[PDB]
Design a protein around this ligand. Sequence first.
Ligand code: FES
Length: 93
Amino acid sequence: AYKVTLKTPDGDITFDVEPGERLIDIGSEKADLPLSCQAGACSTCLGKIVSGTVDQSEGSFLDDEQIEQGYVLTCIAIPESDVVIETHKEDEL
Ligand code: FES
């Protein structure tokens, strides 16, 4: 499985995700994570990837530069490695 660490403003939590699954399913169980559209079309769930890789090609909101800087729509992101993501980042846009 992939090891996912969510670095939230109130602490870090680490959990495993079966390959191919979205991290938000167990993530929302283990932490209070902000969501709105749940479909990759807003920035409510924005996070920043610190290490590892995701597939977030389901998303439509971020521009190429934001993706290149490591921003991630956590509601649709699918890990492709162990990943560390800082959550609650929408105020940086
Ligand atoms: S909740 Fe809208 S993009 Fe994730």
